[PDB]
Amino acid sequence: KNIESLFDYSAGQFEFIDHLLTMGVGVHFAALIFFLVVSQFVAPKYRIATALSCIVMVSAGLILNSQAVMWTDAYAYVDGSYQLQDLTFSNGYRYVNWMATIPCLLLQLLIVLNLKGKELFSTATWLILAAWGMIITGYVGQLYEVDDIAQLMIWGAVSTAFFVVMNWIVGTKIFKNRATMLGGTDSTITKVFWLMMFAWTLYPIAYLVPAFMNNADGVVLRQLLFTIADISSKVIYGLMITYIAIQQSAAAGYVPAQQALGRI
Ligand SMILES: *C\C=C(C)/C=C/C=C(C)/C=C/C1=C(C)CCCC1(C)C
Ligand SMILES: CCCCCCCC/C=C\CCCCCCCC(=O)O
Ligand SMILES: CCCCCCCC/C=C\CCCCCCCC(=O)O
Ligand SMILES: [Cl-]
Ligand SMILES: [Cl-]
């Protein structure tokens, strides 16, 4: 149903994509080890954010590793090209973990803005419905990327409506609670908002590729625009989120954060 099914692939295209997804995995999982080790320097009130991206990290990673294995499963070298065999490849599984990856990554931002009690609980709820809202209509959207490009654009459309509002909630929360944040991180927090704007735009480009580049190199650039997107929203976004919690932990009198900071 997907444009990955439509083309035969050069060995350079096939090996590049396999190498892309595998470099992927090395990185969610090596970042897995570092957010484990530093979690001990984070004060009780922030420690679930670090834990949180140890879940974003093992989630993409499994989609990611599952994608590389399905990729090699699906295609074999026949008469000079990689050709589709008995099993299919698709990106529909990256969507269901988008449903997944997101609660956490908005949850982990909210933990560091010092939301608590009823504002945390109600802000998260609206944030997971809205983002899930974006996830499921473009997942619904993407399924017609061969059969109905007009369905692409219109769910594309209905997904973009959600994104913008999601971004409006987050935006509002960040700029409203800037004042509560410690240790200089009120300037830091606004780099995160921007860093997270770039990552999440790469995904509708990444998704308009069947519309504007329905060929095998488009398939490549899709997967490419994914590794950036990914390493930035899960991985790079992640490390950003973890510096803030340690810095705030230190300004709150949490001694291990203070020794950890001073050590470097
Ligand atoms: C895993 C982390 C993140 C931040 C997931 C990001 C996905 C999006 C920002 C998807 C956006 C889409 C829209 C707005 C338009 C085409 C339909 C999509 C769901 C593919
Ligand atoms: C900011 C995170 C960066 C993510 C790293 C992605 C690395 C890809 C780097 C560019 C590779 C240039 C190689 C071009 C591939 C040749 C295309 C082909 O084989 O047909
Ligand atoms: C599967 C082939 C090999 C894949 C593994 C790649 C090797 C490791 C990659 C680099 C790790 C980058 C992640 C950042 C670690 C954060 C800790 C720190 O930066 O101080
Ligand atoms: Cl605490
Ligand atoms: Cl994912």
From TrEMBL:
* Alphabetical UniProt keywords: Chromophore, Membrane, Photoreceptor protein, Receptor, Retinal protein, Sensory transduction, Transmembrane, Transmembrane helix
SUPFAM superfamilies found in the cross-reference section: Family A G protein-coupled receptor-like
Keyword Membrane on this protein? yes
Primary residence: membrane
Keyword hit for Transmembrane: yes
Q: Provide the family line.
A: Belongs to the archaeal/bacterial/fungal opsin family.
Report the protein name in the record: Chloride pumping rhodopsin
From what organism does this protein derive? Nonlabens marinus S1-08
Which gene holds the coding sequence for this protein?
ClR
